[PDB]
Amino acid sequence: RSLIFASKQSLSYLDGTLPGDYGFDPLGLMDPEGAGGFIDPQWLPYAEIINGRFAMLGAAGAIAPEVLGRIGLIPQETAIPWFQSGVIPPVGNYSYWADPYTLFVLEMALMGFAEHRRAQDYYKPGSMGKQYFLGLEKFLGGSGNPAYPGGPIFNFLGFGKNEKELQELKVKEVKNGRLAMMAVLGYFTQAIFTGVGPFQNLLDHLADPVHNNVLTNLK
Amino acid sequence: DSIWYGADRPKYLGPFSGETPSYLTGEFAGDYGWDTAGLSSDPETFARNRELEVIHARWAMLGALGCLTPELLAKSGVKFGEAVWFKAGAQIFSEGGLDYLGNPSLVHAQSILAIWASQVVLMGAVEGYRVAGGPLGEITDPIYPGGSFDPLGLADDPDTFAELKVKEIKNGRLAMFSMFGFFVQAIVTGKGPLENLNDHLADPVANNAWAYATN
Amino acid sequence: SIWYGADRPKYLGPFSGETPSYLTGEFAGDYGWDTAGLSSDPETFARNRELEVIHARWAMLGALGCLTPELLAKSGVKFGEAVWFKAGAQIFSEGGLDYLGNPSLVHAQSILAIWASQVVLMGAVEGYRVAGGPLGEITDPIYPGGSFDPLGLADDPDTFAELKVKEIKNGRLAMFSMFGFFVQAIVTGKGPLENLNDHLADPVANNAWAYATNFVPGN
Ligand SMILES: CC1=C[C@H](O)CC(C)(C)[C@H]1/C=C/C(C)=C/C=C/C(C)=C/C=C/C=C(C)/C=C/C=C(C)/C=C/C1=C(C)C[C@H](O)CC1(C)C
Ligand SMILES: CC1=C[C@H](O)CC(C)(C)[C@H]1/C=C/C(C)=C/C=C/C(C)=C/C=C/C=C(C)/C=C/C=C(C)/C=C/C1=C(C)C[C@H](O)CC1(C)C
Numbered sequence: 341r342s343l344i345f346a347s348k349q350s351l352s353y354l355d356g357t358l359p360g361d362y363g364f365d366p367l368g369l370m371d372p373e374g375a376g377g378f379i380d381p382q383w384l385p386y387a388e389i390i391n392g393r394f395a396m397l398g399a400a401g402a403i404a405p406e407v408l409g410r411i412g413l414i415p416q417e418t419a420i421p422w423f424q425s426g427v428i429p430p431v432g433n434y435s436y437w438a439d440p441y442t443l444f445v446l447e448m449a450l451m452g453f454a455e456h457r458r459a460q461d462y463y464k465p466g467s468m469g470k471q472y473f474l475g476l477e478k479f480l481g482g483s484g485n486p487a488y489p490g491g492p493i494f495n496f497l498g499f500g501k502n503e504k505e506l507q508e509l510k511v512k513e514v515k516n517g518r519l520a521m522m523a524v525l526g527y528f529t530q531a532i533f534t535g536v537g538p539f540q541n542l543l544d545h546l547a548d549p550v551h552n553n554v555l556t557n558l559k
Numbered sequence: 560d561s562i563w564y565g566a567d568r569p570k571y572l573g574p575f576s577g578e579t580p581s582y583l584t585g586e587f588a589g590d591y592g593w594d595t596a597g598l599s600s601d602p603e604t605f606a607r608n609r610e611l612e613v614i615h616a617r618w619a620m621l622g623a624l625g626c627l628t629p630e631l632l633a634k635s636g637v638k639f640g641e642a643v644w645f646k647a648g649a650q651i652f653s654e655g656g657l658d659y660l661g662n663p664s665l666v667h668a669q670s671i672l673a674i675w676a677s678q679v680v681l682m683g684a685v686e687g688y689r690v691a692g693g694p695l696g697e698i699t700d701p702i703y704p705g706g707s708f709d710p711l712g713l714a715d716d717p718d719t720f721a722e723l724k725v726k727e728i729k730n731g732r733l734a735m736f737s738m739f740g741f742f743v744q745a746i747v748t749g750k751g752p753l754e755n756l757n758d759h760l761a762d763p764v765a766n767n768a769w770a771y772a773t774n
Numbered sequence: 775s776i777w778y779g780a781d782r783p784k785y786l787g788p789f790s791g792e793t794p795s796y797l798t799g800e801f802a803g804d805y806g807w808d809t810a811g812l813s814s815d816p817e818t819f820a821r822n823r824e825l826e827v828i829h830a831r832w833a834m835l836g837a838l839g840c841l842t843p844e845l846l847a848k849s850g851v852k853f854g855e856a857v858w859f860k861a862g863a864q865i866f867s868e869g870g871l872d873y874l875g876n877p878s879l880v881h882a883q884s885i886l887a888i889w890a891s892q893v894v895l896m897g898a899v900e901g902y903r904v905a906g907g908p909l910g911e912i913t914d915p916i917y918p919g920g921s922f923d924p925l926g927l928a929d930d931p932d933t934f935a936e937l938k939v940k941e942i943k944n945g946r947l948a949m950f951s952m953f954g955f956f957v958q959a960i961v962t963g964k965g966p967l968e969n970l971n972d973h974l975a976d977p978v979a980n981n982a983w984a985y986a987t988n989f990v991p992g993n
Contacts, residue, residue, distance in 0.1 A: 555673055603811050604812070646990065648986060672978070687788075688789070690792050749991045749992050749993035
């Protein structure tokens with residue numbers, strides 16, 4: 341029943357049936373036929389979860405090295421801001437276990453084994469519970485929901501007995517990822533208009549709030 | 560009946576009145592038969608010109624009051640750093656920034672982008688509400704919303720309502736003429752309106768406009 | 775269609791309530807924007823439409839031709855003055871007008887000959903537009919067709935009307951952009967794409983507000 345700023349149509353296609361449903365579509369890209377019927381109606385919610393899911397990792401990963409090096413659990417040599425970590429060589433490149441072009445290949449290989457399987461569960465549900473893959477294919481069958489597979493591996497700790505628990509935990513996770521997406525976008529843009537890492541920006545803001553806000557920075 | 564309406568109303572040329580446009584029947588406020596260019600002959604264009612005039616008049620009244628009050632206060636003693644009305648947008652670019660009433664504990668704005676964006680958003684919203692509906696009532700008249708914007712009920716009695724319409728258009732046309740004078744004086748003289756008035760009062764014979772006619 | 779009819783997108787979007795009666799939606803680019811009442815009469819409205827379309831087409835040509843020399847100069851093509859608002863003074867140079875820095879090309883020197891040729895040819899074509907000429911007779915003052923529709927894109931009414939709307943929209947955009955060209959040339963004193971580069975370099979510092987304090991009437 342809870343709603344947010346919604347356009348005229350909004351409610352026509354959006355309704356309180358999926359987790360995190362609030363009706364906010366200024367531009368209405370989720371129109372069933374409308375303009376945006378080319379994308380499958382199940383694609384947008386699925387992509388929204390995943391980009392948010394990675395945002396949780398990104399927003400909790402871009403700031404851990406700096407804080408953990410400030411309070412102190414890590415040598416300051418490797419305690420560097422995320423944009424000095426090799427993603428942007430010309431702004432910074434720190435040598436690692438291997439050169440970054442080999443790390444990329446190891447990334448793409450491992451991600452591919454973990455991403456192609458995810459792809460064809462969405463396209464063909466339960467298609468990964470058929471072929472032998474080291475014996476761990478019975479777990480990786482899915483519950484029929486592309487976004488929420490479920491299983492002794494991907495749900496090993498097993499929270500949520502009945503549908504009441506899940507229907508709100510999903511709302512929590514989509515919303516905790518809601519902030520994570522904005523948080524990473526903050527990381528990105530707050531880094532481009534500055535030259536130094538996110539954590540100290542918070543510390544500068546906490547030091548001189550009337551001297552290090554967005555308005556004071558640049559213009 | 561109101562003496563400001565009808566066919567017996569005073570004319571813009573007074574006793575020298577000649578031909579009066581037919582469509583100007585005096586049924587609207589501030590009608591003096593002044594249309595020599597035929598720019599409001601059609602009823603629809605006449606109405607559009609009426610709304611344009613009323614909006615321009617109200618904005619000019621606000622502008623004249625806001626051009627006089629700050630520099631009058633500066634004369635009183637409230638320093639601003641840049642008090643003259645046309646020397647008032649550069650206060651932001653200064654190191655101190657734009658400080659209301661010359662005090663740091665006021666708004667204390669320093670970034671023109673923020674002011675521009677906030678004003679754009681707010682003015683767009685309010686201007687849309689002006690023609691369409693909005694929180695402060697719906698659209699009843701394009702330029703006289705009604706009791707929603709008349710909390711003191713000055714329009715309750717129709718005769719006083721028409722008289723107030725005439726007075727509003729009068730004061731507003733005066734304000735518009737004064738605003739044109741402000742613009743021309745700033746372009747030509749380059750000085751503030753109050754300082755121009757003081758110079759005129761000092762030696763009006765010589766410190767008049769004819770002095771600056773030398774180009 | 776969507777654009778033609780009572781229910782058409784208006785210039786104020788959801789905030790449009792006072793739609794002029796004479797603006798019903800039977801002409802291209804009818805957003806219901808007439809607050810000065812300058813097109814109330816049908817004949818005056820037709821004349822205004824003709825003026826709008828001719829101005830739109832000329833503005834399209836001007837916008838394309840003001841920046842084409844800029845792009846060619848950025849690539850490396852040599853000109854006399856790439857900038858549009860000094861592109862006309864090179865006729866007075868000793869080398870004449872080279873037209874892409876090629877002496878073998880037009881290579882004009884006398885502005886008087888250019889003026890006379892332009893007067894004659896433009897008078898001829900303008901008169902043909904008003905009264906008809908070699909390229910067909912005059913039926914629609916602004917949509918002649920025939921010799922000016924060689925590709926025959928305006929064959930069925932629907933595509934012809936949609937193309938009307940698209941033409942008028944690109945033309946209004948071009949007119950706005952050319953007013954921008956003129957004002958920016960007046961104030962900044964630099965070419966359009968050079969202003970674009972300055973804005974991209976330091977958007978916060980290199981912008982229009984930087985020139986706000988240049989026309990201060992000190993006297
Ligand atoms: C009637 C008739 C008839 C026939 O038919 C024809 C003819 C003759 C043509 C006609 C006439 C007309 C006329 C005369 C007109 C006029 C107008 C005006 C004056 C306006 C103003 C108008 C005016 C106006 C708007 C005003 C406005 C103002 C403003 C905005 C302000 C602002 C500001 C200020 C405060 C100051 C500060 O520091 C800043 C700023 C921000 C800058
Ligand atoms: C609608 C409405 C409504 C209501 O009723 C009222 C109002 C509001 C008033 C209205 C509005 C209006 C408007 C806005 C208008 C605008 C216009 C424009 C912009 C134009 C342009 C326009 C534009 C145009 C023509 C353009 C043109 C161009 C050209 C020629 C060019 C030329 C050239 C070039 C190439 C460059 C080279 O080197 C040289 C030259 C030779 C220089």
